[PDB]
Design an enzyme around this catalytic site. Structure first.
Site, mmCIF file in Angstrom:
data_model
loop_
_atom_site.group_PDB
_atom_site.id
_atom_site.type_symbol
_atom_site.label_atom_id
_atom_site.label_comp_id
_atom_site.label_asym_id
_atom_site.label_seq_id
_atom_site.Cartn_x
_atom_site.Cartn_y
_atom_site.Cartn_z
ATOM 1 N N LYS C 191 0.823 -1.195 0.000
ATOM 2 C CA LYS C 191 0.000 0.000 0.000
ATOM 3 C C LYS C 191 0.857 1.245 0.000
ATOM 4 O O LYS C 191 1.610 1.503 0.942
ATOM 5 C CB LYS C 191 -0.937 0.078 1.194
ATOM 6 C CG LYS C 191 -1.836 1.287 1.083
ATOM 7 C CD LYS C 191 -2.886 1.429 2.175
ATOM 8 C CE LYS C 191 -2.355 1.957 3.497
ATOM 9 N NZ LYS C 191 -1.660 3.260 3.331
ATOM 10 N N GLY C 244 4.085 3.975 12.076
ATOM 11 C CA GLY C 244 3.193 5.130 12.272
ATOM 12 C C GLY C 244 2.983 5.552 13.736
ATOM 13 O O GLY C 244 3.846 5.364 14.586
ATOM 14 N N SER C 245 1.855 6.213 13.982
ATOM 15 C CA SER C 245 1.434 6.686 15.300
ATOM 16 C C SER C 245 1.127 5.552 16.241
ATOM 17 O O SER C 245 0.642 4.501 15.816
ATOM 18 C CB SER C 245 0.211 7.533 15.208
ATOM 19 O OG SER C 245 -0.266 7.830 16.488
ATOM 20 N N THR C 246 1.383 5.772 17.521
ATOM 21 C CA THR C 246 1.158 4.754 18.525
ATOM 22 C C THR C 246 -0.255 4.224 18.556
ATOM 23 O O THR C 246 -0.458 3.012 18.668
ATOM 24 C CB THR C 246 1.502 5.294 19.909
ATOM 25 O OG1 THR C 246 2.881 5.684 19.942
ATOM 26 C CG2 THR C 246 1.282 4.199 20.948
ATOM 27 N N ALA C 247 -1.242 5.099 18.521
ATOM 28 C CA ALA C 247 -2.599 4.602 18.625
ATOM 29 C C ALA C 247 -2.964 3.692 17.478
ATOM 30 O O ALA C 247 -3.598 2.650 17.681
ATOM 31 C CB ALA C 247 -3.561 5.754 18.674
ATOM 32 N N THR C 248 -2.544 4.059 16.281
ATOM 33 C CA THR C 248 -2.843 3.250 15.132
ATOM 34 C C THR C 248 -2.163 1.922 15.290
ATOM 35 O O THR C 248 -2.766 0.875 15.042
ATOM 36 C CB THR C 248 -2.433 3.946 13.829
ATOM 37 O OG1 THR C 248 -3.186 5.173 13.698
ATOM 38 C CG2 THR C 248 -2.746 3.027 12.630
ATOM 39 N N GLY C 249 -0.921 1.953 15.738
ATOM 40 C CA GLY C 249 -0.179 0.736 15.939
ATOM 41 C C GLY C 249 -0.967 -0.242 16.784
ATOM 42 O O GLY C 249 -1.128 -1.408 16.409
ATOM 43 N N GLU C 266 6.880 -0.365 13.768
ATOM 44 C CA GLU C 266 7.761 0.714 14.212
ATOM 45 C C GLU C 266 6.989 1.996 14.475
ATOM 46 O O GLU C 266 6.342 2.553 13.587
ATOM 47 C CB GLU C 266 8.893 1.012 13.238
ATOM 48 C CG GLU C 266 9.819 2.108 13.772
ATOM 49 C CD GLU C 266 11.019 2.427 12.940
ATOM 50 O OE1 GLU C 266 10.965 3.359 12.163
ATOM 51 O OE2 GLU C 266 12.007 1.744 13.080
ATOM 52 N N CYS C 300 11.420 10.214 12.146
ATOM 53 C CA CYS C 300 11.126 9.318 13.260
ATOM 54 C C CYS C 300 12.040 9.410 14.467
ATOM 55 O O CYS C 300 11.603 9.106 15.574
ATOM 56 C CB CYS C 300 11.225 7.888 12.786
ATOM 57 S SG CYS C 300 12.899 7.453 12.312
ATOM 58 N N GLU C 397 4.732 13.957 21.264
ATOM 59 C CA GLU C 397 5.421 13.937 19.982
ATOM 60 C C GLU C 397 4.949 15.064 19.066
ATOM 61 O O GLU C 397 3.770 15.156 18.734
ATOM 62 C CB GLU C 397 5.173 12.597 19.299
ATOM 63 C CG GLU C 397 5.828 12.434 17.947
ATOM 64 C CD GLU C 397 5.522 11.101 17.307
ATOM 65 O OE1 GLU C 397 5.037 10.212 17.964
ATOM 66 O OE2 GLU C 397 5.700 10.993 16.115
#
Ligand SMILES: NC(=O)c1ccc[n+]([C@@H]2O[C@H](COP(=O)([O-])OP(=O)(O)OC[C@H]3O[C@@H](n4cnc5c(N)ncnc54)[C@H](OP(=O)(O)O)[C@@H]3O)[C@@H](O)[C@H]2O)c1
Lengths: 495, 495, 495, 495
Positions: C191, C244-249, C266, C300, C397
Site C-alpha cells: 500500500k 506510524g502513530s502509537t494509537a494506530t499501531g 515501528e 522518526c 510527539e
C-alpha cells in the site's frame, strides 16, 4: 630399580604430598623401558627434590599406538557429544577440590610466588569448565539451492596430535593444549617440559575418575631433542603444536613440512607500551611495572619497549625508578613477595650477558644488573634508558626483568616506530582520549591490544601473533578452527 | 625487438582476435627487461601460434614492489568495502559480454572441446558475481562479559600473496585464486602457466575498466623453475598458494617453511566409484564415463577406480565397453566431439608408458592404448581389468583417459578398501537405498562425496583433499578463512 | 474516463517527465475497477499536479490473488537463488541511470530540499545493491550427534506479506520493505501512501526490465482506512508490516492478532541529546541543529530533548540561538536552502497547536512559532527552554521543527532521566572522554546510540525501537530474521 | 490455618516423601494472603492426596515486584556470564541425585506409566546441562566499514517474562520455559498448572542450594482464569509465553496485544503418517502405535491421520488391529504397562463424546470406545476407518487415544492432502527409497518431519508449528532468539 611408583614429598608450608612417577599410558603409571632416570632440582634451594623415570623413543612409540586405538575403536567418537563434554567438566571439578596442593606444587616446580600461582589455578579451572560447553555446539552447514540437489558440510577431527609444552606457566600450557583437542574428538601424545615436569604428571591421576577412556591422553617426558624428534617425525601424527624460540620454530617447521603435516606455532616477541600525556601517571606506572616483572619476567608478551610522550617524560621516569625500590623479591612461599626466582642458571647467565652487552654498546644503566646474592636463581631488576633505536638491546629478546624507556614526540611517529619489527604479538595503550585510543589501536599492528590494562586474560578472548611471530591461536572459540577439517557431500535427486 | 604489443590472430571459426603480449604491471603492458621470448604452440595443429615476451627475476621484483605500494598506500583498503565489491561485479559483466571469443581462445590454448569450454565460462562468471557479495559481509565479533571490560575481534587481510596457476582449466584456476584475495583487500603477484598463457593475459585488458587501481593485480609469465623460486623465496610475500604433483608440493613446502610463510596446497589424487546392485545400470554407465573422459582426462578428481557389486558385474562391463565405442574424438572446434586433445607430448609419452607397464605387470587390456594416428596429441581411450589390488597401475596417478574396473563383494569391505590410500580427494556412490547411501558417505574418507552424480560443481560448495593430498580449500565461503587473520583488542573501563 | 495511462508533467527545473497512472498488477498498468479518482497537490505551490485512479477493495483482492499465483507456481522459488539476486541488482542500476528525474520527482512530492533528496537516492541504490548479495547466503544448519541420526534445519519464506508505506522518506520506505522480502522468495501486496504516491509508481516501470516475473510485486494505492483493512483483515496474508502513530499501531495489532498473523511494527518516539563539557561546542552545535531541522523535522528519530551540562550552559544556548538565524528556508528547487516545506496543512495545524499549548502551560519561548507567511506549508523554526520535566510539551510527539533545551548536573542523573519514558528509539552523546562515552552508551536504553554524530545512516547497520516503541528491525542482515521460519527434519538410520 | 508448610506423603512403591506447600517467592515458602485452599486428586485412585494453598492476585503482584528487584539491582546481570551458567549446571545435578522420587512423584501427579516417566527425567537433565553451556556464548557483532566509524551490535535480555505451564509433560514444560530465560539474564513469574501442581513445587527446594539469588524464579499457583489475567494484563511484564487450545490462544493474543507485548505461542495440531509400500510393515506398525498411544494420547503432536499406500493396505490394517490387543493398560506403578490414565474426567467425557459423534456421522468403528471399567480415568483404545475426508472426526482435535486409517494412491496426491489444513506441527514418513523420502520431506509443510522414527526427541533439535498453529520455537539454540533484542551503537571518529 629402586624407584617406587610414588615418593612422599614434604612441602615447606605444612603439606603432605604424594608424588607419582613413571609415564602415563592407557591410564597406567609405568616405568620407562630402558630403566633410565634423571634428577629434579629446586630453583631456590639449589637442591634435589626427586628422581623421575626418563622416557625414550621406545615409549614414545607405545604412546602413539595407544592413541591410535583410542581413536579408531570409536569409543571416544561414536557418541552423543554431550558425554564428551560432561567428562571434561567433572575433571575440572576434581582439580578445584585439590587447589591447595596444586598451587604449592607449582610454586615448588618454578619459583613463581605463591601469591600469584593461585590466580592461574583459578583461571585454568574456569577455562576448562567453559570449553566443555562446546562439545555439542560444533555444527555443520546446510547449503540449499535449487530443487534437485542437497549439500551439506560437516566438521571432522583431524586425528592424533602431537604437542609440546614449554616451561613458563605449566598449568595453562597444559589446559590450552589438551582441552581444544578433547572437545572435538582428537587424541593426544603430549611431551611434558623436562625442567619442570612434576605438576603435569600429578594431575593425571584424576583422568580415570573423570571417566576419560584409556588411550585418549598419553603423557611422556624426557629430554627434548630426543623425544621431540621421536614425535614430530613419526608418520602417524597428523598435527604438530609448538611454542618457543624463533630458531627452533623454523627448524621444526622444516621437518614437519616434509610429511605435509599441519603445523601451528607461537613464538615470543616484543611489545610497545605507549604512554600519553592524558593518562594519569600514577596508574600508568603501576601497569608498566606489572608488565615487566610479573612471573620473574619469563612471559611471552612482557614487552620492554616503553615510549613516553615528551611533556611528561621527566615525571614518568622519576616515579617509575623510585617505585621499583619496593618490589620485594624473595621466598616463593611467602605471600608478601612479588618477584620470585628464575627457572635455572641457563637463563640466568643469558640475562646477565645481555646486561653487559648493553653497558658496552652504550646503553645507560639506571638500576640493577646485579645477581641478588650467591644462592638461588635471583636477579636484581633493571632499568635502562637513553638507548638509541639501533641498539642490539632493543632488537633482542631477553625474556627476563629488563626494561628500556625512550622518548615519544608525535602520535604518527610512535605508530610508525611501533610497527617496525618482525615480532607482532601484543601492544599496550595508556590514555583517556577516545579519538586517540581508537586511532592507535587500529594502526599499531599486533596480535592483541590492551587499553589501560595489561596482562589481563579471560577465557573468551583469543591470543596469538600477527606475522612472523606465529601461526594460529591459543584460546577462545576460534582456536577450534585448527583442530578440524571440512568434508562436503553433494547429492542429486531425480525428483 | 620486432614484437609489437599486439598481434592479429585468425581463429578457425570465423573470428577476428587481437592478442596482447608483454607483462601486466600497474595496469600497463610492457616488454620484458631482458628482451627474451618464447613460442606458443597449437596442440592439435602441431604449429606455432605466436611469440610472447618471457619474464625474468628482474620483472618479478618489480611486480612485488608494485603490489606493496598498492596495499600500503591505503587506496584499496581504507574504503567502504561495498566499493571493492562493485568493481569486481562489473569486471565479471565485461567478461560475459565477450563470451564468444573467450570460449574460442581457450579451445585454441588447450584442445578442450568447444562444446564444453562454454560451460566453464558460464561457471566462472557466476562464481565471480557471487563472491563479490561478501565484500561487506566479513564481520568481526563482540565479546561481552562483566561490566568493566570491552573485547572485540577483527579480521584483517594478510598482505601480498604469491600464486601459481596450473594448466587444466585456466579460467577457473584464475578466478579461484584471484577473487578470494581481492574481496578481502589482499594484493596478488600471479604466475601464469607457461604452456597455456594466452587467455589469462587477454582478459586482463578489462581490469582498468572495472576500476581496480593499479598495482592490485600483477601478471607475470615465464618458465616455472625460474619464476617460481623468484616468488616463493622472496622476503615480502606472506602467503603461497600452489597446486600440482606431490613431489613438487613437498619441495615447495620445504622452501616456504624456511620463512615461516603461510602455505596452502592442493595435490591430485585418486578416487573410487562404488556401484551398487540397486542403481540403474544405464545411468551408472553414463556417469562413470563422464568421470573418466571429461576434459581429456586431465582432471584432478577424475578417479579411475571402479568397484562393481558382483551380482551385476557382467552387465556393467558388457555395456560399459560397448558404450565407449561412441566417444567421438576429434577437432576441438566441432560441437559434435566429446574428447579433445592432450596438452603436450610430455603427458602423451607418460600415459603411453604406463599403458605398457600395465601390460607387463599383468593387467588385462580390454581396449585402446594406441595413439590416435600420427598428428596432434590424441590418445585412444582405454579400459583395464582383472587387476589385482597390488598392481602399480592402481597406485599411480595417470592423469589421462585410463580406467580400471574390479569386483565388489560386501559393503564393509568396499569401505575398507576405498580408504586404504594417501590420496583422499573425492569419492562417488551409485544407489537408491537411503540407508546404504548414508552409511557409505559417512564412512568413506574423502574431500568430497558425490551421490548419483559426478563432476557436478556449484559455486556455493567447497572442495579440497582430506589428508596427505592437501591443506586448505578452494571454493565457497570457507575458502576465505585462509586469507585472513584475527586481531583482538581488550580494554579496561574504570567505571 | 478521460484519464489516459500517462500524463506529461513539466518540472520547474527544465525537465520533461512522463507520469504513469493506474494500479500496477501482473506488471500492467490498469484503471481502477470502480472508476474513481483523486487529486494530487503540490505542497509549496498550493496547487494541483495531477489526477490518479483511486483503488478499492475489489482491486485489493485481485492483487492478492496475483501474489498467490506468483508464489505457488514456483517460478520465483524453484530456482538457483543467485538469479533472484541478479534481477534485483539490475533493477538498482536502472534506477541509478535516471537519478536526475527521480530526485526532482521526490522534491515535487514532498517539499524536501533538492540539495538533500539526492542523498537518499544514493543511499537507496547502495542498499539495494548490497542486499542482493544475500540471495545465495541464506544457509541452514547441520546438527550432527551420534551415529544413528541425521538432523537438519532449513529456512523457508513465510508467504504473502502485506506492507504499509508512510510519507516521510518514500524512497527508503520503499526499499526497506521490498528488498528484504524479495531476496528470500516472498511476494508483496504493497500500500502506497495516499498523500505522496507519485514517485512510488513511477519507478515501477523498470520492474519488467529487471526481469522480475509478474505477480511478485503488486502496487495499490487509495485511501488508508479503506485499503488498509482490506489488506490486514484478509485470510491469505501471512505477515503485516506497519509504521506510524502509537494509537494506530495498537489498533492494527488488535485486528491482526485475531488471525494469528505475524506482525512487525515501528512507532515514532523521542530521544535525548546529551552534551558534555568535554565536547567542542562548535561541533556540538552543528550536530544538534541537523538533528532537529533535517527534512522539515518529519523524522522518526529527530529528538528534541537536549540536555546541557551546567558549566557550559550559557554558551551552548548563546551560540545555538544565534546559529539558527542562518537556516535558510524556502524553495525546494534551490540548492542553497536547508529547510523545505511541511507535508500538508494537517500537520501544520497540529504543530502550531502545540506551540500555543507550550506558551500557556508555561514554557519559555526563545524563538519562532510563527507561520512563515501566508502561502505554502512553511513554519518558522522554534526553540523553547526553562521547561520543567512535567510539561506536556516534553512528553508529547511534535514531529516538526521544535526543540527544548534543559539543564544537566551529573552523569548518573542524566542517565536516569534519559531512560524515563516509553519511547526508546535513539539517543546521542557528545564528548571526548572514553570512559564517559562507554558508560553512558551502555546505560542509556535506546534502539540506537550515536557518538559524536547524528542521523548518520549506513546499509550495514540495524535500526528499530527498544520497548514500547516497536517490534522488529528495518535494516541490515538481522532484518531477514522476520521474513523466515525454520523447519526441521530428523531421520533415523538403521545402520 | 491447619496447613503446615510440609506434609508426609506415603508413596505406593515404598517411598517416604515430604511434600511442601505454599507459594515460592524470594526463595521462601509462604502461605497465600487470603488463606484459601484446594484439593489435589489422584487420577487412578479417585482420591485425595493433599491440600495446597491457593494463590490470588495479591500474591501475583508480590511476585512481580520481586522479579523486578532481582533484575534491576544488577545481581543477576552485572556478572561474568560463566557464573550464571555454573549455577544452572549444579541445579541439574542436584535433581539427578533424587531421580527415584521424582519419577514416582510425576507418576502420582498424572498417571503416566513409571516405565516411561523415567525417560523424561533423563531427558530434562541432559537438556539443562547442555543449555547452561550458552551462558558465555551469546556474542554480539562488529561491523567494520570505512576508516572513520565504529559499529557494534549487542544482545540484551528483554526483562520480566510471564509464563504459563500446561499439564502434559510437566518436567519438560518446566525446563523449556525456565532455562532459556535464565541463561540470558531474564527473570520469571511462572504459573504452575492447577490440576497437576505438586512436582513443580517440590523441585524448587533446590534453587537456594544451586545459588540462584532470590527473586529470579517465582512460582505461583492457583486457578487459571484468575491468575492468568493477573499476569498477562499487568503493565510490568514484557513477554508472554503460552501453550494450549486454539481459542484460548487467540484470546490471549488479543489481550497481550493491547500492551504491545511480545507474545509467543504453541497450539496443538494434527499430523499425517505416510506409509509407503517400500517400508517393512513390521517396523511401521510399531512406530505408528507408539505415535498414537504414548502418554495416554495427551501429546501435542500425536497425529491420528494415517495414510497407507493401497498395495499394502490389507496387511497394514490386519496387523495393526491385532497388534493393539497387546497394549497392556493399568496401574501407573507397574513397569509392565504401556498405557496409563487420562488426566481427569473432563477430558474423559470429551473423548467419549467424539467417539459417539464418529459413529453417528458414519465412521466405521474397528475397535474400542468403551470406558475401561468403572474406576479411574481409563479408556479402551480405538481404531476408526473408512472415514471420508469431510468427516468432523478428521478435522477436530481429540487429544486422546483415537486413530483413523485411510487410503493412499499416489505420492503427489498424498502431499496435496497432507498440506490441506491449518495445523502444521509435524509429519512422519515411512520408506527406504532415498528419492521419495527427500521429495516428500521437502514438500509436506510441517513444523517438523520425522523419517522412519516417531516421537524421537533430542535437546539439540528445535520444535514448533509452521503457520496457524504457532509462533516461535521451544528448543535448541534458535529458541534464544525470542528472549533477546538487539541494540546498536555507532560512533564517529574524527581521525
Ligand atoms: N500440548 C497441547 O497440545 C495442549 C496442551 C494443553 C491443552 N491443550 C488443549 O486443551 C484442550 C482442553 O483443555 P483445556 O480446555 O483445559 O485447555 P485450555 O483452557 O486451552 O488450557 C490452557 C491452560 O492455560 C490456563 N489458561 C487458560 N485460559 C487462560 C487465560 N485466559 N488466562 C490465563 N490462563 C489461562 C489454563 O489453566 P487452568 O485451566 O488449569 O486454570 C490451562 O491449563 C485439549 O483438548 C487440548 O487440545 C493442548
Amino acid at each position: 630399580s629402586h624407584l617406587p611408583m610414588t615418593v612422599p614429598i614434604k612441602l615447606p608450608n605444612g603439606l603432605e604430598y604424594e608424588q607419582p612417577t613413571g609415564l602415563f599410558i592407557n591410564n597406567k603409571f609405568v616405568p620407562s623401558k630402558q630403566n633410565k632416570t634423571f634428577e629434579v632440582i629446586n630453583p631456590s634451594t639449589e637442591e634435589e627434590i626427586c628422581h623421575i623415570y626418563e622416557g625414550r623413543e621406545d615409549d614414545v612409540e607405545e604412546a602413539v599406538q595407544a592413541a591410535d586405538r583410542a581413536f579408531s575403536n570409536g569409543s571416544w567418537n561414536g557418541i552423543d557429544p554431550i558425554d564428551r563434554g560432561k567428562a571434561l567438566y567433572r575433571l575440572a571439578e576434581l582439580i578445584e577440590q585439590d587447589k591447595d596442593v596444586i598451587a604449592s606444587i607449582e610454586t615448588l616446580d618454578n619459583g613463581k610466588a605463591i601469591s600469584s600461582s593461585r590466580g592461574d589455578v583459578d583461571l585454568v579451572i574456569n577455562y576448562l569448565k567453559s570449553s566443555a560447553g562446546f562439545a555439542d555446539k560444533i555444527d555443520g552447514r546446510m547449503i540449499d539451492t535449487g530443487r534437485t540437489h542437497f549439500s551439506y558440510t560437516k566438521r571432522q577431527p583431524l586425528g592424533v596430535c602431537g604437542q609440546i609444552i614449554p616451561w613458563n606457566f605449566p598449568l595453562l600450557m597444559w589446559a590450552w593444549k589438551i582441552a581444544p583437542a578433547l572437545v572435538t574428538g582428537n587424541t593426544v601424545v603430549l611431551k611434558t617440559a623436562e625442567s619442570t615436569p612434576l605438576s603435569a604428571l600429578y594431575v593425571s591421576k584424576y583422568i580415570p575418575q573423570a571417566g576419560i577412556p584409556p588411550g585418549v591422553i598419553n603423557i611422556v617426558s624426557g629430554f627434548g631433542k630426543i623425544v621431540g624428534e621421536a614425535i614430530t617425525n613419526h608418520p602417524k601424527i597428523k598435527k604438530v603444536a609448538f611454542t618457543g624460540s624463533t630458531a627452533t620454530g623454523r627448524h621444526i617447521y622444516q621437518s614437519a613440512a616434509a610429511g605435509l603435516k599441519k603445523v601451528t606455532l607461537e613464538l615470543g616477541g616484543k611489545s610497545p607500551n605507549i604512554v600519553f600525556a592524558d593518562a594519569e601517571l600514577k596508574k600508568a606506572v603501576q601497569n608498566i611495572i606489572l608488565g615487566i616483572y610479573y612471573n620473574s619476567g619469563e612471559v611471552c608478551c612482557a614487552g620492554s619497549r616503553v615510549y613516553v610522550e615528551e611533556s611528561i617524560y621527566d615525571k614518568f621516569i622519576e616515579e617509575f625508578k623510585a617505585a621499583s625500590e619496593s618490589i620485594k623479591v624473595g621466598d616463593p612461599f611467602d605471600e608478601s613477595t612479588f618477584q620470585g626466582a628464575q627457572t635455572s642458571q641457563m637463563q640466568l647467565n643469558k640475562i646477565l650477558k645481555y646486561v653487559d652487552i648493553g653497558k658496552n654498546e652504550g646503553a645507560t644503566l639506571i638500576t640493577g644488573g646485579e645477581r641478588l646474592g650467591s644462592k638461588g636463581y635471583f636477579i636484581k631488576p633493571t632499568v635502562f634508558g637513553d638507548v638509541k633505536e639501533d641498539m642490539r638491546i632493543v632488537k633482542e629478546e631477553i625474556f627476563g626483568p629488563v626494561v628500556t624507556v625512550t622518548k615519544f614526540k608525535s602520535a604518527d611517529e610512535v605508530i610508525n616506530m611501533a610497527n617496525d619489527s618482525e615480532y607482532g604479538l601484543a601492544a599496550g595503550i595508556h590514555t583517556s582520549n577516545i579519538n586517540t585510543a581508537l586511532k592507535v589501536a587500529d594502526r599499531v599492528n599486533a596480535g592483541t591490544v590492551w587499553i589501560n590494562t595489561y596482562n589481563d586474560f579471560h577465557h573468551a578472548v583469543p591470543f596469538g601473533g600477527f606475522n612472523a611471530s606465529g601461526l594460529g591461536r591459543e584460546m577462545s572459540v576460534d582456536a577450534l578452527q585448527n583442530y578440524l577439517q571440512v568434508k562436503a557431500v553433494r547429492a542429486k535427486l531425480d525428483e
